[PDB]
Amino acid sequence: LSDTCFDVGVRNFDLVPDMYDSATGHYKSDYVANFDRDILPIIQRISQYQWVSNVQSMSGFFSFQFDYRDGSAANKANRMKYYNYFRQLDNKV
Amino acid sequence: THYEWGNLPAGVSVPDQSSVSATKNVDEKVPLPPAYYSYWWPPQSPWDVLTGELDTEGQLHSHLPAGQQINYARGINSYSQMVEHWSALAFIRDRNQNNDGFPFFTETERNHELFDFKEVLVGQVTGNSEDNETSLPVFFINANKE
Amino acid sequence: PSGELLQGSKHFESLGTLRTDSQGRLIVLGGYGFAGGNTDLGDDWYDDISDGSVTCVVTYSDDSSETSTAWMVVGSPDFAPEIVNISTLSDTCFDVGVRNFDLVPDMYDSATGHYKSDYVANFDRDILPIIQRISQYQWVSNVQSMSGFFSFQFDYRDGSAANKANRMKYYNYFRQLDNKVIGDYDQPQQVLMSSEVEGDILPLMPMNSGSNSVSSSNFYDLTDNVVEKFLALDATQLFLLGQWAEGEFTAGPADDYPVSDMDTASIGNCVGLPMCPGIEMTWSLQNPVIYKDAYQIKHYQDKAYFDVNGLTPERDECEEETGCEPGDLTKRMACPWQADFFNCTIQTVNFSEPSVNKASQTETVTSRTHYEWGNLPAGVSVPDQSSVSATKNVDEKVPLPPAYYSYWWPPQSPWDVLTGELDTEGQLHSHLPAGQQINYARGINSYSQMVEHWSALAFIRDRNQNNDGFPFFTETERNHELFDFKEVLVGQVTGNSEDNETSLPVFFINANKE
Amino acid sequence: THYEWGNLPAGVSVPDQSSVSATKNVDEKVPLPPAYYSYWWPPQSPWDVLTGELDTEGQLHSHLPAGQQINYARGINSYSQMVEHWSALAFIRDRNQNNDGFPFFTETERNHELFDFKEVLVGQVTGNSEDNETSLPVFFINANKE
Ligand code: NA
Ligand code: NA
Ligand code: NA
Ligand code: NA
Ligand code: NA
């Protein structure tokens, strides 16, 4: 629910002006994320759904078969494969 | 159903018998196949958990040895049983809390004394005594227990 | 086994087929799944399994010969060929080779009987495979306690002194190997947990049953029957994990051992540990007395000796150090093999008494039924009634509580698998939607049902094979049409109609179905 | 319940384990024992009757041989079921009416097709494969039937 209140805050309350442009209604593609603060928690959360459910298909997203920290252009294809397995959000129509 | 008699003596002929039966089941709200077994909120409402009783006493009241994956809500067989017995449910916590990066989450503080146990042999269901080599566990709450 | 068999398979015709390709390469194809006997279910019983000598004579243009040899082993189906056993049979043959055949002289000193602490291990070649194997036991078992050993919560590649404590914590969770002494039980392989202190609890690694979680010290009219409760890696695997813990390792390429890629390709797909007996082979493969060199079986006698006299039945290739006779590598396994496959599931291991696996249990149930009548009219008194009942159940071989739910060989015999039927047709014949974890052997309710229906079992394989690091293993090719289904409501068991809100699935094989 | 482990090796021993549980059933309007099994209006409401199907097509749909004492309302298991399917019950008729003083009353005109059957092996109730040599007759009405 903190992710909810935070998401609401970004797209509607200028919480982070470097991440979102309220005039364009769009996010800012020049925003530099940080692994440990923005990315690692998600990888950590997925990894703990196992003790309470059988969600083995989620395994390959916290196995570090490739370096998740490595942001070099050589590693882009791996990070793109990982990312394009995530579902995009639906339009509210 | 088709009936036919054989091993009858020379000269003896018995006419076969035939009968047609029918059953029709209608359901209004049913998931449409192909279906996928999907979870709701595993952190807030567990469903696939480990056995955490480590001593003898607890293994006799729980009827399961430690470290086996079994249904979180086993024993509560109805919505009204959950309205009344929700607090007899286990807390899922790390038994290795003091060692980072080495978690071991099990069931802890489950009210084992409320649930009765019944080991149902497969034959009791199939009528075949061979199937009695295998059994399945049935947990339930007896309202007449005190 | 001549004639006709009263039970199971009726006629024995062959042990398999020998072929050559377009280039004259040998192809050894084994048994068809024959299993029959003359006793109910087992004395007069037999199977299709085999093993033996491979002899090659390449004659040249100048009419001069060159004779070379090898071994052949036939096994029961590998139902998840992609999932690897933490310790394979190649790991066994390799470990034997290090400690007994100088395979790697930089790693072991045969004069001191000890390993060499100055050996520099390599992450990718010695360490990463173990981390990769542990990570795949999930698709076939529920071994979540093993998770923290492939989570990369810390950098496994980092060998800097700052990272030593983390690598030492990881390493000291692994079980050390037991001494091969006859009556010494209080050892590390009889130890399940890391501690008994709440907040410091975790099953020691590898979390699997050992080579004897079944019989106790006092079984078979003995007082010192050998016990080995829980699993450990082999000597060579744990040693290299020791070198990594220490930081005596590298990142980047490393040269392969003096072993062929072809030699590991075979036995690498066989169970190394545990051996009770195991799936393809047993603890004869651990004895160096069987080998002439690392990975190379010693051959006892010649073709002429066998043409004249046949095989030696009473002979132990472990006692007499002179080599193997055809059929020696498989003779210790069950007859028929379906027994070993039937018991390759899970063990319920005692973890309080080092020398006990099973004991006799005695349950006494003493009840008092009490009857009392009320709402009776003024003046009317009815005497209460009381009766005492008793029940006494005695069992001879029962695991001693506290018990731990332990696995046998998850890669070779699956037990906790996912539903893989993706279309409607298949979801109606299977009666389960996709992606649900359910028992691998559901439907087969007896040892004799497994003797007859073992080939109706599913193959566990990656549905995402084309995308590395993104596996998705499910059931595939399960003979769904054989199994009937029955949704049993809880009330049918408890007599309480409320419990009928919940049900449980019952799968079985009807012999009258055709 | 009391547990006791044995066949343990020399010097080895484990503590006994024992538990005490209880059940309490309170039933409001129950007849007082000792009681006598007493009929109401046998000629207007038959209870213990004889099956009178003389051919194969009759015995297959009835599942019973002729001349057997069984319950008149076998298959009617509910008060609601009686309100729905009363007219399915037999008429007990003298089958030797022509002859005088030689009567032979049996069931006639039963709607056998409405009723489904199931032979329950005793061992399916007890868990004991050995009781399967004996089976219990169970008649019921299935609404899914067409
Ligand atoms: Na859930
Ligand atoms: Na939570
Ligand atoms: Na297994
Ligand atoms: Na395998
Ligand atoms: Na009456």
Question: How would you portray this structure in words?
Answer:
The structure is cut from a larger assembly and holds 4 copies of chain A. Chain A is mainly alpha-helical. Chain A has 3 helices and 2 strands; from the N terminus they run αββαα. Chain A has a two-stranded antiparallel ribbon. In chain A, 10% of the residues are buried. Chains in contact: A-B, A-C, B-C, B-D, C-D. The interface between B and C is large, with 52 and 61 residues. Strand 17 of chain C pairs antiparallel with strand 1 of chain D. The complex binds sodium ion (5 copies). One sodium ion is lined by residues 39-42, 45, 47 of chain B. One sodium ion is lined by residues 43-44 of chain B. It is classed as oxidoreductase. Keywords: oxidoreductase. The entry is titled "Structure of the epsilon-lysine oxidase from Marinomonas mediterranea".
Write a concise synopsis of the structure shown.
The structure is cut from a larger assembly and holds four copies of chain A. With 93 residues, chain A is mainly alpha-helical. Helices cover 34% and strands 4% of the residues of chain A.
